[PDB]
Amino acid sequence: LVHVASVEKGRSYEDFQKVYNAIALKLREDDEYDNYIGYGPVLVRLAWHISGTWDKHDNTGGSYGGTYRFKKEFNDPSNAGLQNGFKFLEPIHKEFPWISSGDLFSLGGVTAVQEMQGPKIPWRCGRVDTPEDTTPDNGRLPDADKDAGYVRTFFQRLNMNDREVVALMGAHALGKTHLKNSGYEGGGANNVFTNEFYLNLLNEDWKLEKNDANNEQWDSKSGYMMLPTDYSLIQDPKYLSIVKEYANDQDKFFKDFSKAFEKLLENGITFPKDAPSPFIFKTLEEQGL
């Protein structure tokens, strides 16, 4: 099953930069969402969830088809709360109706990461909207209540290795969990992209507790939390080494996250050899906007 990237007809880099900028300007404007966290984190999560349905074995799922716009995927219990990212992106789509759904969703994540002072993430256009019957079934996104063996096995389906898994998980520096969405509560409420996920893992004093929803989570005396899946990155000795590396090398973490996150967003897409090179978008700040 082959999904060929097809550039939106007549569009070029500058066109996508304008979409980036509208997203970035709206991020800045709508700053009150979720107790002043802003929409950055949820947009990063949206991009991951529309990508994380991919299965390397048959090339179903992934960002390409923009299938999150369909009821079945939109309502996936694993996607609870992402409706907020979707609503954010509505007026962006109306301003730029020529962009595919998959391109918009993935670009939202790229824009959020960069505008939160994260690394540049190269991004490629050409996802094409596919019909409702291409919508993957629920259940393909990962559970939070599991251990490192689960996380490792799970991410093999997305063609991600130990370093790529640990790198990607560093996005859990961003935002927070909400009891109503996932049955967890707590987090840093942070909207600046850093390597602090790794530092928190290593430097805090963690205690495993059951929460109000009867789910297990790791809680620190300073009031941070980690999922069992997060904490598994320090229980497992291979993951631990990589955690230690990223806790001690901001630039390495930035480079590795960028590669892994672009790979995540491009899994399942065949780019023809006459496709444009990946675009690197300027931040608002770099444009003097």
Residue type, 71: K
Q: Which helix (H) or strand (E) holds 13?
A: helix 13-29
Tell me whether strands 186-190 and 206-210 are parallel, antiparallel or unpaired.
unpaired
User: d(Cα 22, Cα 91) in Å, to the nearest integer?
Assistant: 10
**C-alpha to C-alpha distance for 243 and 280, rounded to whole angstroms:** 27
Site string for ligand HEM, 81-120 (x = CB under 6 A): x---------------------------------------
Strands 216-220 and 206-210: antiparallel
Of the candidates 93, 157, 176, 244, which one interacts with ligand HEM according to CB under 6 A? 176
- C-alpha angle 45-85-52 in degrees, rounded to nearest 5: 35
Which is nearer to ligand HEM, 34 or 245 (by Cβ)? 34
Q: Which two tokens stand for residue 227?
A: 């999922």
Q: How many residues make contact with ligand HEM (CB under 6 A)? A: 24
Give the whole-angstrom CA distance, residue 39 versus residue 191: 9
Asked if 109 and 93 touch (Cβ cutoff 8 Å), the reply is no
Nearer to ligand HEM, 93 or 176 (CB): 176
* Contacting residue, 166, 168, 201, 234, with ligand HEM by CB under 6 A: 168
State which of positions 15-54 bind ligand HEM (CB under 6 A): 41-42, 44-45, 48
Least spacing, CB of residue 100 vs ligand HEM, in Å: 21
Tokens (6 digits) for 221? 């005396």
Q: Two tokens at 32?
A: 């009150």
Rounded distance between C-alpha atoms, residue 207 and residue 221, angstroms? 8
Give, as one character, the DSSP assignment of residue 272: P
Binding residues for heme b: 45, 48, 172, 176, 178, 181-182
Q: Which is nearer to ligand HEM, 103 or 164 (CB)?
A: 164
Among 142, 259, 275, 284, binds ligand HEM (CB under 6 A): 142
When binding is defined by CB under 6 A, the residue of 181, 220, 250, 283 that contacts ligand HEM is 181
Closest CB to ligand HEM among 122 and 142? 142
Beta bridge partners of 202: none
Query: How far apart are CB 137 and ligand HEM at their closest, in Å?
Result: 18
User: Does residue 169 interact with ligand HEM by CB under 6 A?
Assistant: yes
For residue 248 the two structure tokens come to: 């001690």
61: contact with ligand HEM by CB under 6 A: no
Beta partners for 186?
Answer: 177
Residue 37 or 128: which CB sits closer to ligand HEM? 37
| Site map 252..271 versus ligand HEM, x via CB under 6 A | ---------x----------
Residue 229 touches ligand HEM, criterion: CB under 6 A = yes
106: its two tokens: 């993935």
- Site residues (CB under 6 A) for ligand HEM? 41-42, 44-45, 48, 81, 142, 144, 151, 168-169, 171-172, 174-178, 181-182, 184, 227, 229, 261
